[PDB]
Paper text:
The Keima family comprises large Stokes shift fluorescent proteins that are useful for dual-color fluorescence cross-correlation spectroscopy and multicolor imaging. The tKeima is a tetrameric large Stokes shift fluorescent protein and serves as the ancestor fluorescent protein for both dKeima and mKeima. Keima was developed using a nonfluorescent protein from the stony coral Montipora sp. through semi-random mutagenesis.
Purified tKeima spontaneously crystallized, and its crystal structure was determined at 3.0 Å resolution. The tKeima crystal belongs to the orthorhombic space group P22121; the cell dimensions were a = 69.88 Å, b = 83.50 Å, and c = 109.78 Å, occupying two tKeima molecules in an asymmetric unit. The tKeima monomer had a β-barrel fold with 11 β-strands. The chromophore of tKeima was located almost at the center of the β-barrel and contained a tripeptide Gln63-Tyr64-Gly65 that showed p-hydroxybenzylidineimidazolinone through posttranslational modification. In tKeima-B, the electron density map of the chromophore showed a cis-conformation, whereas no electron density map was observed at the position corresponding to the trans-conformation. The A–B * interface is stabilized by 14 hydrogen bond (molecules A–B*: Glu97-Arg150, Pro142-Tyr191, Thr144-Arg146, Arg146-Met160, Arg150-Glu97, Asp158-Arg146, Tyr159-Arg146, His169-Arg150, Tyr189-Tyr159, and Tyr191-Pro142) and seven salt bridge (Glu97-Arg150, Arg150-Glu97, and Asp158-Arg146) interactions. Consequently, Thr93, Thr124, Tyr189, and Tyr191 correspond to the key residues that disrupt the interface of tKeima to generate mKeima.
Residue numbers in the entry:
A (entry chain A), B (entry chain B), C (entry chain A), D (entry chain B): -2 to 62, 66 to 222
The structure:
Amino acid sequence: SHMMVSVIAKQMTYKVYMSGTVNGHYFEVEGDGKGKPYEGEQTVKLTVTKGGPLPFAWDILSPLFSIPFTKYPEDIPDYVKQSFPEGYTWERTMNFEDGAVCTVSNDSSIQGNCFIYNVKISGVNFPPNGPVMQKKTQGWEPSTERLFARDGMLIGNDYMALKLEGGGHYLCEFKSTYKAKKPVRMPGYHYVDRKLDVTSHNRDYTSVEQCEIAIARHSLLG
Amino acid sequence: SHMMVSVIAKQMTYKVYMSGTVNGHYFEVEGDGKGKPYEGEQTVKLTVTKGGPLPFAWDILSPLFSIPFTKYPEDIPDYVKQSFPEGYTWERTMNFEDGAVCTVSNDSSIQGNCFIYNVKISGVNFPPNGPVMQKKTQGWEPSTERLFARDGMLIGNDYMALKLEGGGHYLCEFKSTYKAKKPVRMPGYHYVDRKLDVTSHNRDYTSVEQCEIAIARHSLLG
Amino acid sequence: SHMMVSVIAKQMTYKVYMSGTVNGHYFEVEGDGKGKPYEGEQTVKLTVTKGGPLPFAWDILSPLFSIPFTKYPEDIPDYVKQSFPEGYTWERTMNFEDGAVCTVSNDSSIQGNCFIYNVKISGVNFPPNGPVMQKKTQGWEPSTERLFARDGMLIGNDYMALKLEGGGHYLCEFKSTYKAKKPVRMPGYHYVDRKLDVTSHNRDYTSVEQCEIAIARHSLLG
Amino acid sequence: SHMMVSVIAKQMTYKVYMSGTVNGHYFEVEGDGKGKPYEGEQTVKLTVTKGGPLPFAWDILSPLFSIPFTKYPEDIPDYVKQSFPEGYTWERTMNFEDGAVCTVSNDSSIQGNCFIYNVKISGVNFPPNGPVMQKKTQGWEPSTERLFARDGMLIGNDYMALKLEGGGHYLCEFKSTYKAKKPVRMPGYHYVDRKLDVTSHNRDYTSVEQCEIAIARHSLLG
């Protein structure tokens, strides 16, 4: 009784296009990714095409490179997958504890076996001797995103933690808004457990590979 | 597993004394609890001693009434349980989406097989037609606190939500600091799942019963 | 055509009562003050009656010790003064940049020549080696409060700056809500320039004297 | 007074190029300005080059179109004016009360008696029935930025407000970082008063004229 949608194959690839500006530095990143949407497992190779090498931590960009690769159980409506073939948009604001702010905008369509993601990031007020600019980050902690529906949109908040060179953590608030381009069956209050890891990286992070697992769940208690 | 500690029984009680001002209204509340600390289970009966009946939704008080009762797996250092016999303190900020703010301090100490909790709460800028002042809230969704160690303190953040009448959600944002009165072993980044329900109540919530499950865990994906 | 109100003499005294808790430390402060309401000049002697000596900076409490001592020009309605003889309430939230939060609640009545102020403060999550707890503060900078009316209330935001031992500043956001206990003539968008200085202080800040000047104005341009 | 500087005339011009995405809508805007830098006076005519007409209130763009044109008294070190001939950069966060966020970066350089400004803006989570998306805003109230020196950067915060149709105010909160490309003399805690008006506009705001006064000052009370 767990139902797949005919536009999303059990194995799909995607292409990501990303322009951005962080502390006034402009950069373009391109990426090819592949995974199993209904199993919530994905991987993507990223090439920095313009503005490399990047003067900030890679870890601030990693969470902007693929939402349809979430495992939804049979009793929870998959808002994102239901939106295809037309697609979805999302906007995101990331708030770090040293005062830095990022705004993100993403549009997503499909072209046969392939997802197209366009993504812009604008990041400002990054402490010049902070972990992001001194590249003292060491990958994300596994997160749980709270999600609910409001005005036919899907809101998501996530308290995240960048691991720091020399132990300790650098905190960040995620607030996500997902807008389907087509009326879909809205889900209730639910959670997405996520783990993102950077798997391979050359020395100047101009060529990076990362893998994500994304599982949607109910309350684990009751 | 659960690394049991000789000072805290498998079956314990607690006495909670709470005083507080919300929207200028002063109130005092006393309570008697009981639970299985190494299993993360507990009920508690409250009585509003002074300022009953209360002009705000019981639900804004519900999460200030018992942290020892948290099932920690043996591979996670149990910060609060090591803090005893001496005791611990915690401070909290409860920031609601409609501009309400609450500040909470607590002082915990043990007496045989009885826990002692003193807790003061200050709450302001609660909209007079909002859900809390109009008493239209219907209890807390299950949540997942993110705790980590910093300067010998345990820092938790959680993105909460009050269920509302006629569907919908009233978003709250919790930020807690836990401070043991005695050097203890620090835990790594880890999570606590919680479900908290008002089981019984009189007609003006001057007598209330609540029950809490609370289980520590690692990432469900790694 | 600048109009005084018969309940507020050109010279008035006041009495302040303040209970509070900061980083879990309880304290009571009492104060006698005197000034010229229509000239916006005041002074008050503060005695710490309980919980002294205080383990935190004095400068976090100073801005909670007298609003009717503001100079309003003839063309701007004085919301606060118009509320007497019955009085006003106000709630305040102070947000420091090291993450600390304070909530404040104040009720104000009049008794002949004398204003009575009751004030509670709850302050939490103050970094233990931050300027407030290490007492590295050196008085407030002069502030301008933006003020406007909403729902027959007066909202006030102020970006403030504590001066630091060794130069540099420790920032704080003020958000104030004033509620008259009686319908008054609402004012428009306007500014209150304020300067608070601590004038005298014994060595343990158990006996402190401070003076404030508070001037309400229009836009200085146009 | 005004400590004049040989690189910046008493009468100067500027060319502003702006690109930006607000609510996923991409737009480009070019402009020609002129003003009396040591008097703090300037007009500028804008033309929307790409993405005209704009689906949001002009007023959210109005404050991203010229910091050299600020009357500094001789007793205040004029951070931006010392930064030239090289140039300066600034980053800004514009946080609105209804959850909207904008991020802005700018790069400034001089060319004879012409200033060059490049400015990108990212804006997200703008409510579709809110005042900006419904174009019900009617220009900015006069404001007062609070600037101070930190790690060789100038940090300004200001509490702003957009005038609304049918009375009322739509609150915004500005946080700017100013960074000169060349060691300059740092100013003390000081204030900037500003008034900014849309003087003229076509019917779809694809041609707009704005005028700005901007005067630095010490505390008006000390």
